[PDB]
């Protein structure tokens, strides 16, 4: 009732907050990051600079929040997922933290709905399967303990991944 899987483009989703799979610089890149910036327009980058200027690099596992410009969302939460390196560099934790701190920021800003892409599973090369496990476990356990956020959307770029989530979800 509170967690949903949707297949498509995260930039098209009308929710309170859209989550960006960013990198420490916060400055832009490709994948979701590029899509988001493109969709949002220049205001997003202005904003990310202001942030950067104020707290420097966003460390891995942490998150920040900014305005959303032209996006149908109200804000964008930029989180820094870990780069995959075999699984013996505390990656699973860092990925967890990325989801967690994202959620906390959503809540702290009184936002009721949030959309997540599949953090760290593209360029960063996180095994698609383990990641989804963490994403789903972390988000689920969190929303269990908290009123906010009310709604969560797992946005999946393809059908393969979507089914993954779908199953992992109803597998508990």
Catalytic positions, written as ranges: 33
Alpha-carbon distance of 165 to 157, in angstroms, equals 12
Closer CB to ligand APR, 15 or 21, in the complex: 21
What is the contact surface with ligand APR in residues (CB under 6 A)? 9-10, 21, 23, 29, 31-33, 35, 81, 83, 117-124, 155, 157
Closer CB to ligand APR, 10 or 100, in the complex: 10
Alpha-carbon distance of 62 to 19, in angstroms, equals 12
Closer CB to ligand APR, 18 or 147, in the complex: 18
Alpha-carbon distance of 33 to 19, in angstroms, equals 9
Burial readout 72-87 (b: 16 or more C-beta within 10 A, e: otherwise): ebbbbbbbbbbebeee
Structure token pair of residue 81: 């997922």
User: Do residues 105 and 8 lie in contact, with contact meaning Cβ atoms separated by under 8 Å?
Assistant: no
Structure token pair of residue 10: 């995260």
Q: How far is the CB of 124 from ligand APR (least distance, A)?
A: 4
Instruction: Please identify the residue of the shown chain whose CB is closest to the bound ligand APR.
Output: 31
Q: Based on DSSP, count helices (H) and strands (E) in the chain, helices before strands.
A: 5, 6
Distance of CA 35 to the CA centre of its chain: 13
User: Do residues 34 and 90 lie in contact, with contact meaning Cβ atoms separated by under 8 Å?
Assistant: no
Q: How far is the CB of 30 from ligand APR (least distance, A)?
A: 7
Q: How far is the CB of 62 from ligand APR (least distance, A)?
A: 12
User: Do residues 161 and 118 lie in contact, with contact meaning Cβ atoms separated by under 8 Å?
Assistant: yes
Q: How far is the CB of 86 from ligand APR (least distance, A)?
A: 15
Closer CB to ligand APR, 23 or 96, in the complex: 23
């Amino acid at each position: 009732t509170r967690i949903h899987v949707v297949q498509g483009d995260i930039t098209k989703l009308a929710v309170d907050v859209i989550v960006n799979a960013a990198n420490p610089s916060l400055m832009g890149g490709g994948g979701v990051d590029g899509a988001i910036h493109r969709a949002a327009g220049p205001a997003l980058l202005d904003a990310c600079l202001k942030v950067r200027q104020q707290q420097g690099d966003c460390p891995t596992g942490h998150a920040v929040i900014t305005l959303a410009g032209d996006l149908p969302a109200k804000a964008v939460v930029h989180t820094v997922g870990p780069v995959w390196r075999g699984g013996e560099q505390n990656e699973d934790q860092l990925l967890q933290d990325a989801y967690l701190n994202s959620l906390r920021l959503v809540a702290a800003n009184s936002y009721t709905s949030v959309a997540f892409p599949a953090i760290s599973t593209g360029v960063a090369g996180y095994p698609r399967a383990a990641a989804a496990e963490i994403a789903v476990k972390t988000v689920s356990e969190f929303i269990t303990r908290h009123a906010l956020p009310e709604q969560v959307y797992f946005v999946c770029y393809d059908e393969e991944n979507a089914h993954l989530y779908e199953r992992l979800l109803t597998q508990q």
